[PDB]
Short mmCIF file of C-alpha atoms in Angstrom, two decimals:
data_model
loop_
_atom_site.label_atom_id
_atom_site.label_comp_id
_atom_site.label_asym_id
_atom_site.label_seq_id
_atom_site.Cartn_x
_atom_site.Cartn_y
_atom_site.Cartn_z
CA UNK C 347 144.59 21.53 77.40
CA UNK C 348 141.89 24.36 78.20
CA UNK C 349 140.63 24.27 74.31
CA UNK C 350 141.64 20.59 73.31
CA UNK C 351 141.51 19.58 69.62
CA UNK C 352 138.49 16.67 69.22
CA UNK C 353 138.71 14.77 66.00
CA UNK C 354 135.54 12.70 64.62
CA UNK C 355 136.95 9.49 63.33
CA UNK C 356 134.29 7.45 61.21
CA UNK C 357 133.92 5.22 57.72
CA UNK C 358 137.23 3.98 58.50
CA UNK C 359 139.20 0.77 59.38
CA UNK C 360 141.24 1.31 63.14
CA UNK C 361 144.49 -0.79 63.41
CA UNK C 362 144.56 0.40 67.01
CA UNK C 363 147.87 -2.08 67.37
CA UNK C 364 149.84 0.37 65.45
CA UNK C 365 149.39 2.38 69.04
CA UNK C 366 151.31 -0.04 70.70
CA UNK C 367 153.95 -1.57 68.08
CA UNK C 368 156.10 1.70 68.71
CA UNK C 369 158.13 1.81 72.18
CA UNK C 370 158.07 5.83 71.64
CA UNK C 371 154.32 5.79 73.88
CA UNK C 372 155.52 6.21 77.91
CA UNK C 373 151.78 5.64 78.85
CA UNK C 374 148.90 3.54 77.88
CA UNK C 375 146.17 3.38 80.34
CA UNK C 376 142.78 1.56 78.52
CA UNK C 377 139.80 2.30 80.79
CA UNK C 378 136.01 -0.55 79.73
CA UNK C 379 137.91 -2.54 77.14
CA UNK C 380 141.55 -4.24 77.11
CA UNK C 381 143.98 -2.89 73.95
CA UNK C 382 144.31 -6.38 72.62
CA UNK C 383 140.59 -6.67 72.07
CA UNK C 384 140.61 -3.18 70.17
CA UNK C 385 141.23 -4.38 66.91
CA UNK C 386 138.15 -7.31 67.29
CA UNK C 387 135.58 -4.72 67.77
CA UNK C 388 133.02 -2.17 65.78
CA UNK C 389 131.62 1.24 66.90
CA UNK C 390 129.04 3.56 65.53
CA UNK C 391 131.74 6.55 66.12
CA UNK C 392 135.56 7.12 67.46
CA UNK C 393 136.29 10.57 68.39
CA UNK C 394 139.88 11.16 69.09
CA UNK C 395 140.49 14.26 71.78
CA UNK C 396 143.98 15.60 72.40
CA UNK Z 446 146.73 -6.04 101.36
CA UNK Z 447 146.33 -9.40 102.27
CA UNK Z 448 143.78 -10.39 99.69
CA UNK Z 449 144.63 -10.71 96.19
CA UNK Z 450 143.12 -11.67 92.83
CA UNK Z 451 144.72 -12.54 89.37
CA UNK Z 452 144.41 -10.01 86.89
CA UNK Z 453 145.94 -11.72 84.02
CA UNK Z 454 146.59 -15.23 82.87
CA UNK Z 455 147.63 -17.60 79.51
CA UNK Z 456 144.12 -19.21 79.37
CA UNK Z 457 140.75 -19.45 81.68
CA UNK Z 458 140.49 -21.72 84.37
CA UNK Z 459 138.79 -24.81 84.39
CA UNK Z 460 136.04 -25.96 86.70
CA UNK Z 461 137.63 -26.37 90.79
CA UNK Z 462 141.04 -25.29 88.80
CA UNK Z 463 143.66 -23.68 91.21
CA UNK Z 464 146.91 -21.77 90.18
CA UNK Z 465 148.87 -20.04 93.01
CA UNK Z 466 151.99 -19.19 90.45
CA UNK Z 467 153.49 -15.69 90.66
CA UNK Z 468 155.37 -16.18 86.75
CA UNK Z 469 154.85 -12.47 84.68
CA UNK Z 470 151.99 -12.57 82.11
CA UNK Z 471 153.43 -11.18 78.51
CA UNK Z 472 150.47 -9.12 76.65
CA UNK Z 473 152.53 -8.21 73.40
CA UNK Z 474 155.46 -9.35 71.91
CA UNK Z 475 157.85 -8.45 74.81
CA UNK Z 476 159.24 -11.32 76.67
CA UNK Z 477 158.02 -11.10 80.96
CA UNK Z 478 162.08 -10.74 81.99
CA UNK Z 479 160.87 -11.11 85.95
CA UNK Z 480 159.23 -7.23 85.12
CA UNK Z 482 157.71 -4.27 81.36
CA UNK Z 483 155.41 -2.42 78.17
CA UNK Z 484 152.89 -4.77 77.81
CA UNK Z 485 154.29 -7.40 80.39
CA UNK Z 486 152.78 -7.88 83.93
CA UNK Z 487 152.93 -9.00 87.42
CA UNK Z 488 150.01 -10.98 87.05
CA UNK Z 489 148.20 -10.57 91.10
CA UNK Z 490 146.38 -7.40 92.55
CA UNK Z 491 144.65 -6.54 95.52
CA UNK Z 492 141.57 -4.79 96.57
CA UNK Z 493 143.52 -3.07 99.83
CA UNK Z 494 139.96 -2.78 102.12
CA UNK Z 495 138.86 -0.06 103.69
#
């Protein structure tokens, strides 16, 4: 966590309900936008810190 | 505490609609069980200060 890896994801189709079909995930906390509206919407970039 | 707002609900209210009912909201495919991963108590509260 003091030298996290950031991933730019672009030119690329994001089934973001793939995040939330597996029970394996023991949090999911969505802050601007609800996760059921994730896979209706476009953005000019997704980057992807962990 | 005492004031509350719902969070969650099935569809949008109409015009002067009013809906007091306290039944679990399901947000995925799991079924509301009176709890759950995408399944919630549907009320909050502001708690002021």
């Amino acid at each position: 966590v003091y030298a996290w890896n950031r991933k730019r994801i672009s030119n690329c189709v994001a089934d973001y309900s793939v995040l939330y079909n597996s029970a394996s995930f023991s949090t999911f906390k969505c802050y601007g936008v609800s996760p059921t509206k994730l896979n209706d919407l476009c953005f000019t970039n997704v980057y992807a810190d962990s | 505490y005492n004031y509350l707002y719902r969070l969650f609900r099935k569809s949008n209210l109409k015009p002067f609609e009013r809906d007091i009912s306290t039944e679990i909201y399901q947000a995925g495919s799991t079924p509301c069980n009176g709890v759950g991963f995408n399944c919630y108590f549907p009320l909050q509260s502001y708690g002021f200060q």
